[PDB]
């Protein structure tokens, strides 16, 4: 399963925001996305981690950084903007032996 | 940068009839070099598996649509699904909702 913490994060505009996505009992082949919930509660992709590389969908402030010797990942927003405020989550996919998606619970970011 | 969108996010169907569900994807991020795979997963908790009830109408894929079909809808088919597309290393998904009308 996946967890995503802290459950609530408040930072001043311009400061970094860091969430941790933590994967339990996952295999070596990690494919992990960072998503944000829209006002309608639809998921929107922010960044992707695969191979051992993070890539942002369009904003390079969003980086997924694997932690030392863990299936734990920092989801960093560098230099936050007030309109980054919202609910975020992480999701992971395995393609073998069976297709599965796991989602973390949401975590809320407030940028003041 | 590959992404999936869901311009249609809520679907309605009567028990006994079939429902179609779809999500669209960015094709200029998908070639036949790295393959393309699509899946529908019913949300039953935090982890989703492939739906047993739905199948993929794969003729829509070259048009950038992942179109799923569930025949003979029953009440238990109600609720949220994740519409997932994978293009090589890249993947994304959207939530879709099925609303069911049951009569006698």
Swiss-Prot record, chain A:
GO terms for cellular component: external side of plasma membrane. Disulfide bonds join 21-90. The keyword Repressor does not apply. The chain holds residues 34 to 145 of 288 of the full protein. Monomer. Interacts with CD274/PDCD1L1. Interacts with CD273/PDCD1LG2. Interacts with FBXO38; leading to ubiquitination and degradation by the proteasome. Ubiquitinated via 'Lys-48'-linked polyubiquitin chains. Deubiquitinated and thus stabilized by USP5. It is found in: Cell membrane. GO terms for biological process: adaptive immune response; B cell apoptotic process; negative regulation of B cell apoptotic process; negative regulation of immune response; negative regulation of T cell activation; negative regulation of T cell mediated immune response to tumor cell; negative regulation of tolerance induction; positive regulation of T cell apoptotic process. Residues 1-106 form the Ig-like V-type domain. Glycans are attached at residues 16, 25, 41, 83. It comes from the Eukaryota. Residues 37-44 are annotated as: Interaction with CD274/PDCD1L1. It comes from Mus musculus. This is Programmed cell death protein 1. Thymus-specific.
UniProtKB/Swiss-Prot annotation, chain B:
Belongs to the immunoglobulin superfamily. BTN/MOG family. Keywords: Adaptive immunity, Cell membrane, Disulfide bond, Glycoprotein, Immunity, Immunoglobulin domain, Membrane, Receptor, Repeat, Signal, Transmembrane, Transmembrane helix. GO terms for cellular component: plasma membrane. Disulfide bonds join 23-83. The chain holds residues 20 to 123 of 247 of the full protein. This is Programmed cell death 1 ligand 2. Changing residue 69 to A: No effect on PDCD1 binding. It comes from Mus musculus. Residues 2-99 form the Ig-like V-type domain. Interacts with PDCD1. Changing residue 22 to S: No effect on PDCD1 binding. Glycans are attached at residue 45. Involved in the costimulatory signal essential for T-cell proliferation and IFNG production in a PDCD1-independent manner. Interaction with PDCD1 inhibits T-cell proliferation by blocking cell cycle progression and cytokine production. Expressed in immature and mature bone marrow-derived dendritic cells and splenic dendritic cells. Highly expressed in placenta, liver and weakly expressed in heart, spleen, lymph nodes and thymus. Also expressed in some tumor cell lines of lymphoid origin. It comes from the Eukaryota. Changing residue 37 to S: Significantly reduces the binding to PDCD1. One of its GO terms (biological process) is negative regulation of T cell proliferation. Changing residue 97 to Y: No effect on PDCD1 binding. It is found in: Cell membrane. Its main location: membrane.
